Each structure stands twice: as structure tokens, then as C-alpha cells.
Amino acid sequence: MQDWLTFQKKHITNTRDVDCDNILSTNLFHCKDKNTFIYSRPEPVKAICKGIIASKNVLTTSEFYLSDCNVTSRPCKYKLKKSTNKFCVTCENQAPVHFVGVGSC
Structure with a gap:
């Protein structure tokens, strides 16, 4: 449900x-x-x-x-922000299932 499959389309x-x-005006982001x-x-x-089977929030080793x-x-109108930073992903069953935040966890 809130797992790698949904995580992918919305973050990859x-x-x-x-x-x-x-992209964001689809029902996937709404x-x-x-x-x-x-x-x-x-x-x-x-x-x-x-290697992270148990639900564990991990911060990336690099950006x-x-x-x-x-x-x-304006609603539903976006500004693109291109940057380079690390991020914490909630790892479960060796797959990022939840997104925590960027920089650190």
C-alpha cells in the first residue's frame, strides 16, 4: 500500500x-x-x-x-527546484516504502 511500488511512481x-x-495534476498527486x-x-x-528488512528510516551516505x-x-502551479542533497528513506523489506525528508533523518 504505502510501499516501494507507490513510492516509485511518486518519487522516482x-x-x-x-x-x-x-505530472502533479494527475490523481496520483492531485x-x-x-x-x-x-x-x-x-x-x-x-x-x-x-539489507533493511525491518521498517527503519535511513539517511543516505551521499547526496x-x-x-x-x-x-x-497559485494552486496546482509549481516551481521546479533542482538540487543535490541526501535523504532519509524508510526502508522495509529492503525497499524504500516511506519518504522521511532530505538532508538528514
């Missing part, structure tokens, strides 16, 4: 330029306040949780290329 992007406008996407494949991101879509002054 393969482009630095995620079009927040269209234009919430913001959404931090990770520019990296699901494999190297799932590998962060490699990743993040693209954060955040709402502007």
Missing part, C-alpha cells in the same frame, strides 16, 4: 526536469503542496535499503540529484 524520476505542471522527486533509477535508490516540485502562489 529519470529526468532532472520533471514537468510538475502536468496537486498537493509539494513533491520531491529523485533523479536516479529505482534500483540504486532501492539499494539504499538493501542525490533531487527535483522538488513546490506550489507557487
